[PDB]
Design a protein around this nucleic acid. Structure first.
Ligand code: K
Ligand code: K
Ligand code: K
Ligand code: MG
Ligand code: MG
Length: 136
RNA sequence: ACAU
DNA sequence: CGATGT
């Protein structure tokens, strides 16, 4: 502890897992929604959590912001650190879009730099992350 | 077991 | 109850 209020918080939302995936990023302090991705017909929770972090990195870099990013996903934080999303989702025609976006996010990480700290949101101590979809 |  | 991940 405690919370770094000057930060961006991201989270996935889904209808099924695998299922329809979306994500958004919010100002941790105010809850203002700063970006939201159009729903992707089939993906996993972790692919969406990964895309949300990478989108946050790109969003902050474009704006010359040094704010950290909070995610509640141990998995996605590791995938970003590794620059590799180790998803089990079948690659087929139905999953082509999510896998294209994941491939492109990895490619961005491999061609750009950033100093953005990627921090674990401590849900057990602080409650749900401010970007949560409220579906659980 | 832990994190979603 | 089901699923995705380390
Ligand atoms: K939720
Ligand atoms: K959670
Ligand atoms: K499990
Ligand atoms: Mg989450
Ligand atoms: Mg959530």
């Amino acid at each position: 502890e405690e919370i770094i209020w000057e930060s961006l918080s991201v989270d996935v939302g889904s209808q099924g897992n695998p299922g329809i995936v979306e994500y958004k990023g919010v100002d941790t302090k105010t809850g203002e929604v700063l970006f939201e991705r159009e729903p992707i017909p089939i993906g996993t929770n972790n692919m969406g959590e990964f895309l949300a972090i990478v989108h946050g990195l790109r969003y902050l870099k474009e704006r010359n912001s040094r704010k950290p990013i909070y995610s509640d996903s141990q998995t996605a934080i590791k995938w970003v650190k590794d620059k590799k999303a180790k998803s089990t989702l079948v690659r087929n025609e139905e999953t082509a879009l999510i896998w294209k976006l994941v491939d492109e996010a990895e490619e961005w990480l491999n061609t750009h730099t950033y100093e953005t700290p990627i921090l674990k949101w401590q849900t057990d101590k602080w409650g749900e992350i401010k970007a949560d979809y409220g579906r659980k």
